[PDB]
Structure 1
Amino acid sequence: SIPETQKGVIFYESHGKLEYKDIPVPKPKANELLINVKYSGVCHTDLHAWHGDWPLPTKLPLVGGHEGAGVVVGMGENVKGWKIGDYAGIKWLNGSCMACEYCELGNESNCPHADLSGYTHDGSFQEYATADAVQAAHIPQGTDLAEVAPVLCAGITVYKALKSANLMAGHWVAISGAAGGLGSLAVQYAKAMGYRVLGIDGGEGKEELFRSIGGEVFIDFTKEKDIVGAVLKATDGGAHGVINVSVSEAAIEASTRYVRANGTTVLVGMPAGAKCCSDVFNQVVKSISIVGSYVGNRADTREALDFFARGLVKSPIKVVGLSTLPEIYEKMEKGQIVGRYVVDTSK
């Protein structure tokens, strides 16, 4: 059954060298459960955990990775709603104290004692990884653990963002960055939730991919010069809600100018030092909200995975082996990324 040693990609100092080597198998605490992580997505947050450029101190030595779909192989003692052989998911937020005000309200991510898998907890870039039983995702049985792994971070983040834009069905939503990664998952979640997706991206074959996943209007930010005017025209007044899955400060600032009066602008990405300099007079005189959206609680996880489990959203991935890390890390530092990159822990 559970071995005494597994193979993980561990690094010992910030921005250091990633070693795919044998490490011990963790011991599930009385609240945690052990997960034979089958696959695990890789995303920019793993770069930011590697470098350590974010304020929160990173635990070291660290097995990064926070989008890990796997099988429950043995649990803790108080673990209640879980069985062995159940599929589980390691998300960004591994666990919280569940006694603080935020955990009680539902926003466990704002917990001061938040355990961030792959940042301050042994993440999912290993074969066997532990995850708090309360927060682990209840991936249904029979789902492709390869495809759901990117949905564990990008899908749950964009489901929360589209629920944070206070949109109603039929309302225009403008996904700034609407093809690739968070953008395409946001387009599919918005289309499944009822909204009328407008997309703002550019490059080769972006518009046909966008139309394929069910987008309504596509503003090519290369061909088109005035994006704000194009969005105000296509939406007939402005997008009812904007989802800024593009961390560039210019796009973020522009999204406050094509969002409808009384419309919401959700910021999803976490840049290093970006600022949302928005004209205060225009934001006041048009009653525009500029919301920020973090990972999303257990209800948003349940509902995003339930959208996935109906074939409504699909995550085209590229599966590689766990040993291909850190070629993915060094490839991601430059910008040679396309879609989502899943790693298989066995390979």
Structure 2
Amino acid sequence: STAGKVIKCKAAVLWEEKKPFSIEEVEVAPPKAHEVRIKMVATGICRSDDHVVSGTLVTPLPVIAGHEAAGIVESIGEGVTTVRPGDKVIPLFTPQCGKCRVCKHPEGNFCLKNDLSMPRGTMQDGTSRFTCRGKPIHHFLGTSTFSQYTVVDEISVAKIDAASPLEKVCLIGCGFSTGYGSAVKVAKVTQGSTCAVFGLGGVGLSVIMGCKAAGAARIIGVDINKDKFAKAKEVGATECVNPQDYKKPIQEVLTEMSNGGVDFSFEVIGRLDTMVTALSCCQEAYGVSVIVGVPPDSQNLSMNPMLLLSGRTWKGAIFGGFKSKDSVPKLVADFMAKKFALDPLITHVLPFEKINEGFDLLRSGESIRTILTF
């Protein structure tokens, strides 16, 4: 066994912005106290992993990205009580220390031990567990799942059902939960409402599922890629609009279609202009708009505060407002109970070594989610 030993394995390293991932041989240190080393089984390619490449999302490079995954505990550090060697786990990019003021708040989920607000790319102790060619490589959001093995803090891992299909439930580690929770826990979509979902990638289709689950009467998917419409309709959208077909701004189209605005809108792209558009297209007196997409680093949007003064609510959330450690295991149980379906989001499955082809798929608009298997 590898317990207690430095593991040599392959990982996808991003050495510099706007380059393909380089599949390298890396050394994965053994887990210190309160850390878990996991053997990766499957990882999804999420737009947020692409944001690191594109420089949209700023985090120390070089880096092993990937945060939407599912693996098996290989070994645990000293003091680890929550998982054992052998357990199926999902690494959590939003930790749940269970102690800070947020973890104690009934509603919040943005644990103060996150590595999200100002990414350091280190373990909780400020060190890396990864070296490549002698150089220390940064972690990504405490997860770094584009690697055969990764080391995560105990606060960033959830034990799930031993029978879960790891190549499906890897989407619970981000995409699906984010989307679904965004509609059901964050916006709290109501029965009979009209919803507008901007962006129909994996997180957007999950927002659609959540809206359909909460009973939205009408779910308008909006995307500039008309090939995403059939899948959107398949998971619940009632109509799909493409902004480029109209001579009118899409907030006007949506307002006219919904008779003065939708109840709930969601920005699931990451563009400043669509965030303001999504806010705008919601009903002025009682509409709720939720930002889910991640926008370019250090860029501000410009908006007229009168949009909010009339009564609109504008909110954002990380990971669909779910308290990670408590919810991931329940979402898996729920998936195991057929309460929701993850297959419709999986368009492609590729061996890990074809990570770059998986990113070209995403970038080209041909895939929803590509699951990488190890």
Q: CA deviation at 1:137?
A: 3.2
Which of 311, 323, 347 matches 1:317?
A: 347
1:165 aligns with one of 187, 190, 193: 187
User: What SS is found at the alignment partner of 2:48?
Assistant: helix
- State the 1:243 CA deviation: 0.8
Of 198, 216, 221, the match for 1:176: 198
Evaluate the alpha carbon distance shift between residue 262 and residue 108 of structure 1 in structure 2; reply closer, same or farther with a 3 A threshold.
closer
Which whole-Å deviations, capped at 9, do the CAs of 1:103-144 have from their partners, x for residues lacking one? 433645352663767425461111111222333233323332
2:160 pairs, out of 129, 139, 143, with 139
1:252 maps to 275
Structure 2: how far apart are the matches of 1:240 and 1:49?
A: 33
Q: Deviations over 1:38-94 (max 9, x none)?
A: 111122322333455545x41x5422211121112232333323233221112323x
Contact 2:225 2:365 in 1 (8 A): no
> Partner of 1:239: helix, strand, or coil?
coil
Matched residue of 2:280: which SS?
coil
* Distance (whole Å) between structure 1 residues aligned to residue 113 and residue 358 of structure 2: 31
Q: Does the alignment pair 1:81 with 2:82?
A: yes
Contact 1:50 1:64 in 2 (8 A): no
The one-letter amino acid paired with 2:238 is E
The answer to whether structure 1 residue 263 and structure 2 residue 291 are counterparts is no
Shift of 1:268: 0.9
Distance 2:189 2:20 in 1: 44
Please, which of 287, 303, 308 is the counterpart of residue 335 of structure 2?
308
Distance 1:67 1:254, change over 3 A: same
User: Structure 1 residues 136 and 251 mapped into 2: Cα distance closer, same or farther (>3 Å)?
Assistant: same
Indicate if the aligned counterparts of 1:244 and 1:266 stay in contact, CA closer than 8 A: yes
CA distance 1:130–1:201, change in 2 (3 Å): same
Q: How many Å separate the matches in 2 of 1:146 and 1:333?
A: 18
CA contact (8 A) 1:41 1:342 kept: yes
Aligned counterparts, 1:202-281, within 5 A: 202-226=224-248, 227-260=250-283, 261-272=285-296, 274-281=299-306
One-letter code aligned to 1:129: T
Q: CA RMSD in A?
A: 3.0
Alpha-carbon spacing, 1:235–1:144, altered in 2? closer, same or farther (3 Å): farther
- Map of 1:26 onto structure 2: 29
* 2:67 and 2:143 in contact (8 A); partners too: no
Identity among equivalent positions (%) equals: 21
Q: In 2, are the aligned partners of 1:238 and 1:258 still within 8 Å (CA)?
A: yes
Please point out which of 222, 241, 249 is paired with 1:200: 222
Q: Deviations over 1:271-306 (max 9, x none)?
A: 115544333223212x00111121342245345445
Residue pair 1:38, 1:145 contacting (<8 A) in 2 also:
yes
SS of the residue corresponding to residue 134 of structure 1 reads: helix
Matches within 5 A, 1:96-107: 99-105=99-105, 107=108
Match 1:6 to one of 3, 6, 9:
9
Query: 2:128 maps to what in 1?
Result: none
> What is residue 130 of structure 2 aligned with on the other side?
none
Show structure 1 runs of 5+ residues with no match: none
Give, as a single letter, the amino acid of the residue that structure 2 aligns with 1:252.
M
Distance of aligned partners of 1:220 and 1:310 in 2 relative to their CA distance in 1, 3 Å threshold = farther
- Counterpart Cα distance in 1 of 2:53 and 2:274: 27
Paired residues of 1:30 and 1:76 also in contact (CA < 8 A): yes
| Structure 2 CA distance for partners of 1:274 and 1:198, relative to 1, 3 Å | farther
Note closer, same or farther for the CA distance 1:209–1:97 as it changes in structure 2 (3 Å cut). Answer: closer
Work out the CA distance in 2 between the residues paired with 1:107 and 1:92: 15
Q: How many residues matched?
A: 339
Aligned amino acid, residue 255 of structure 1:
A
CA drift of 1:242 comes to: 0.7
TM-fit CA distance, 1:98? 5.3
Choose 300-309 or 311-320, whichever is displaced more: 300-309
Structure 2 match to 1:62: 63
On the 8 A contact 1:91/1:137 being kept in 2, the answer is yes
String of CA shifts for 1:183-242, please: whole Å, max 9, x gaps.
112111221232332222344443332221122333343434443344335444422111
CA 1:317–1:150 in structure 2 vs 1: closer, same or farther (change >3 Å)?
farther
Question: Secondary structure of the equivalent of 1:253?
Answer: helix
Q: Which runs of 5+ in 2 are unaligned?
A: 122-138
Q: Distance in 2 between matches of 1:132 and 1:51?
A: 27
Does the 8 A contact of 2:100 with 2:111 survive in 1?
Answer: no
Question: Normalized against structure 2, the TM-score is what?
Answer: 0.78
State the TM-score, normalizing by the size of structure 1. 0.83
The 1:120/1:201 distance shift into structure 2, 3 A limit, reads closer
